[PDB]
Amino acid sequence: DKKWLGTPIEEMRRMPRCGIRLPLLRPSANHTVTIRVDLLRAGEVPKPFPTHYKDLWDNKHVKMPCSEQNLYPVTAGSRWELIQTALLNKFTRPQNLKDAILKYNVAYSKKWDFTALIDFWDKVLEEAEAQHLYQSILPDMVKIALCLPNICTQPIPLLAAAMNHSITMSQEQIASLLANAFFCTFPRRNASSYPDINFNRLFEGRSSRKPEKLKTLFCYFRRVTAAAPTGLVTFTRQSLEDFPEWERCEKPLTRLHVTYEGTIEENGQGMLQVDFANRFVGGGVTSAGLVQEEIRFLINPELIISRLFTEVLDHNECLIITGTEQYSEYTGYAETYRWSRSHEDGSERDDWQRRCTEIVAIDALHFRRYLDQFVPEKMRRELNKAYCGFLRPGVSSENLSAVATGNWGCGAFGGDARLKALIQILAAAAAERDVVYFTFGDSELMRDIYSMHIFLTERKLTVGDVYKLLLRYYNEECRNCSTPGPDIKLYPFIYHAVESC
Ligand SMILES: Cn1c(=O)c2c(ncn2CCCC(=O)O)n(C)c1=O
């Protein structure tokens, strides 16, 4: 019968109800705020601050396509003026859009393949859908792109490695920026520690995934150019310098809800939603990937702009994004992913007019050899990564939502689900958060995670006791194991070890 086990999900803390009343929104050395805070009002489009466009062109800020420093060889010409010229033409065929984008990307005229764009327009859409795309959606997208200097007036700092810094910007500013990314306008982003931002890889090859990606993104573009979204989104890079001594951590485990049904994004509303991220945030979203991270970034595209400014994550870092809106629904996953329909996001907004949706990008390690992940160094790494993603310095536990997650770094990256579940349970306990864990049809893993959790909680083991058990497993079954897998599985080992004692 049972579709879930443990603590009822109803009993887990959610935003906005668990939330702290926010401090007043204001810019500081660690918080860039790109709108008029004095004028922020529910239901109104935020007004950019400053009033007039200010340009920085340096290695600490985004290089804006509308910068006077964005030049091209004629004698230098203004590449911004060239962009305007190229994009302010009627498109009636996909080649027209390709050629427009190539006018200010001349160096890529042989490298960039547009097959997926051509096939989407010509071979996937119905004739009327194609016509709507080129008569309405694309010209609307061009106009919001070309409005960039009136919309994004404030230089945007890069979130570079080791910085602890936030950027709070409007959904409207994001929309403008992403339309630019679609038209591949961001300079010096094509030719190494930053993800791709321009959408050029979205247009290449013949993956059956590409039409679904494109439909999902057009769903967003149609929505945000028809009526400006009125909210804000904050991006925070978080870097911890000190990590727990896990073997000494005396904290108790927290509560668990575990289910083989539901999704993170729908069932975990209001909770801290894990993005199973690439270290290059968004991974394959505007190229060939389509698993958990790429899906979330497609259905909540404001996530994608993190790639404009977020340097590759180091082992002690994460990215926390608050306020992204869901614009699409889907079915399937990976090679069966399909766009279903438009989504009307019902989420409340906090006092900064952010949707009460908090997502954290934590990248797992890739394990070439399965046993490599049980090495103490590798276990501590994953614990500390997840801990960084879950910890909110200067917030009490009662104000912290549950963590909504699942088999983080399992699948392509070769992670063990039962290990990673326990790692996350320990990270969460240390950060004083409950765990809501989704196994996506895998009912045996639901029961196993549940049985281990209740076992350890009833015997009141601490984070440190459990971590020492993981060390014993490494020392006794892994370190001098003759074979690809060890003699005894982790969970059975832990049950025998504690029941022994
Ligand atoms: C993280 N995650 C999943 O793992 C998931 C899934 N749906 C099926 N699955 C299971 C994997 C199915 C597949 O491998 O194609 N969803 C929606 C998901 O978020």
Side-chain angles (χ1 to χ4, degrees), residues 3-19 22-74 76-247 249-268 270-337 339-367 370-376 378-488 490-501:
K3 300 267 149 63
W4 57 272
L5 300 161
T7 301
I9 202 180
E10 292 91 348
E11 289 176 1
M12 295 301 193
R13 294 186 278 283
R14 293 171 194 267
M15 293 287 293
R17 205 150 30 77
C18 77
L22 283 178
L24 253 61
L25 179 57
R26 64 159 265 266
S28 67
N30 74 333
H31 194 177
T32 304
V33 177
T34 59
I35 57 81
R36 288 288 290 284
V37 168
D38 55 320
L39 307 180
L40 180 66
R41 286 204 257 275
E44 296 189 11
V45 178
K47 168 157 173 53
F49 178 82
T51 297
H52 285 106
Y53 183 77
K54 177 199 179 358
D55 196 53
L56 286 177
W57 182 265
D58 60 40
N59 283 358
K60 286 140 86 191
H61 298 82
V62 171
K63 289 184 173 63
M64 296 290 180
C66 49
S67 180
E68 283 190 4
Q69 311 296 146
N70 182 22
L71 298 171
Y72 76 98
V74 189
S78 164
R79 198 175 286 213
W80 185 239
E81 278 175 11
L82 180 62
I83 287 157
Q84 290 167 274
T85 291
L87 297 181
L88 289 170
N89 283 289
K90 66 108 209 81
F91 311 134
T92 58
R93 306 290 294 107
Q95 188 71 27
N96 310 146
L97 168 58
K98 163 173 186 182
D99 287 341
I101 292 171
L102 285 183
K103 275 166 187 182
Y104 46 87
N105 282 295
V106 157
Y108 298 91
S109 49
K110 34 94 188 320
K111 286 283 133 40
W112 292 1
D113 168 44
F114 287 74
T115 299
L117 174 67
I118 291 169
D119 280 7
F120 180 63
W121 186 315
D122 276 1
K123 294 179 184 86
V124 169
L125 288 184
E126 255 106 14
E127 308 295 304
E129 305 181 294
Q131 280 178 39
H132 182 68
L133 173 75
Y134 63 76
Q135 283 172 344
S136 273
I137 302 170
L138 284 164
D140 281 0
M141 286 172 61
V142 163
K143 283 180 211 132
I144 198 170
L146 296 186
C147 286
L148 188 62
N150 301 127
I151 292 164
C152 293
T153 51
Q154 195 177 136
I156 297 170
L158 297 181
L159 301 180
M163 290 175 59
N164 278 276
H165 194 95
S166 300
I167 303 163
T168 302
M169 65 198 299
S170 72
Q171 292 179 282
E172 187 187 48
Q173 278 163 339
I174 295 175
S176 189
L177 291 164
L178 287 170
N180 274 278
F182 172 96
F183 293 120
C184 302
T185 70
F186 284 99
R188 306 293 175 95
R189 289 299 289 260
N190 302 311
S192 70
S193 59
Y194 282 76
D196 282 357
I197 178 67
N198 288 319
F199 286 16
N200 52 283
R201 296 199 65 211
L202 181 59
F203 310 146
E204 76 192 14
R206 288 186 196 260
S207 167
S208 70
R209 304 305 72 221
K210 293 294 203 294
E212 306 299 333
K213 286 195 183 185
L214 278 166
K215 283 173 177 149
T216 307
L217 290 165
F218 283 132
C219 180
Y220 163 84
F221 284 119
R222 165 70 292 147
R223 298 261 311 268
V224 296
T225 51
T230 57
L232 304 185
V233 187
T234 303
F235 301 83
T236 294
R237 198 185 188 90
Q238 176 161 284
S239 228
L240 298 193
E241 182 191 327
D242 300 307
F243 285 103
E245 290 175 75
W246 293 99
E247 52 281 300
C249 181
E250 281 174 52
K251 261 160 180 212
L253 299 190
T254 58
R255 305 184 290 172
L256 173 71
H257 175 90
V258 55
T259 181
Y260 73 95
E261 290 196 334
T263 66
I264 288 151
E265 70 275 6
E266 195 189 339
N267 302 75
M271 297 183 174
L272 179 59
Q273 306 165 351
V274 174
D275 168 11
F276 307 154
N278 199 269
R279 65 202 277 267
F280 286 92
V281 295
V285 59
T286 47
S287 42
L290 195 48
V291 285
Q292 188 256 17
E293 172 167 53
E294 292 85 2
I295 292 166
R296 198 72 200 287
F297 274 53
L298 293 166
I299 68 186
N300 290 36
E302 296 151 341
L303 287 172
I304 295 172
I305 210 62
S306 63
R307 300 165 61 90
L308 182 59
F309 49 74
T310 308
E311 182 152 31
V312 71
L313 294 184
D314 200 353
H315 299 289
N316 63 327
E317 306 190 286
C318 67
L319 178 77
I320 307 155
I321 317 93
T322 308
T324 63
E325 180 161 331
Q326 186 175 330
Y327 291 89
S328 298
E329 297 177 12
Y330 66 101
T331 64
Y333 184 82
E335 196 70 31
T336 66
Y337 173 92
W339 181 82
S340 340
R341 69 187 72 97
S342 190
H343 184 85
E344 282 296 327
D345 191 328
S347 305
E348 283 184 58
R349 300 191 185 88
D350 57 32
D351 288 333
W352 291 5
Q353 298 300 319
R354 302 185 299 184
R355 304 278 181 178
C356 288
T357 297
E358 179 191 2
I359 295 164
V360 62
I362 49 173
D363 54 297
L365 285 177
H366 175 12
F367 295 108
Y370 174 83
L371 284 188
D372 283 355
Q373 74 193 282
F374 296 95
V375 178
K378 294 319 211 282
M379 299 190 296
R380 254 192 311 291
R381 186 277 176 184
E382 297 300 52
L383 284 161
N384 284 335
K385 172 61 66 163
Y387 179 79
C388 178
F390 302 163
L391 187 74
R392 299 290 180 271
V395 186
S396 146
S397 72
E398 339 279 331
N399 294 132
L400 289 183
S401 61
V403 173
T405 188
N407 298 339
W408 180 42
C410 303
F413 264 31
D416 184 81
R418 286 159 177 83
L419 183 55
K420 273 297 214 288
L422 250 191
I423 285 171
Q424 286 180 97
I425 281 169
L426 300 194
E432 301 203 354
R433 305 183 78 127
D434 298 327
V435 172
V436 174
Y437 197 98
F438 293 86
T439 70
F440 298 103
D442 184 347
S443 65
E444 193 181 347
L445 178 67
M446 176 190 71
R447 169 54 63 154
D448 285 351
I449 294 168
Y450 166 70
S451 303
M452 174 58 61
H453 181 274
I454 198 75
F455 178 81
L456 300 169
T457 294
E458 288 184 342
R459 314 266 181 171
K460 305 192 287 273
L461 276 54
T462 66
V463 165
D465 298 332
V466 183
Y467 184 66
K468 290 216 250 79
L469 289 177
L470 297 179
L471 292 190
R472 286 195 56 203
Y473 181 67
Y474 171 68
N475 292 313
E476 307 179 15
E477 295 301 328
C478 300
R479 190 151 84 73
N480 302 108
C481 154
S482 301
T483 45
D487 225 345
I488 299 147
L490 180 61
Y491 277 18
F493 176 86
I494 289 174
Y495 292 127
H496 177 276
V498 174
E499 281 177 359
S500 272
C501 207

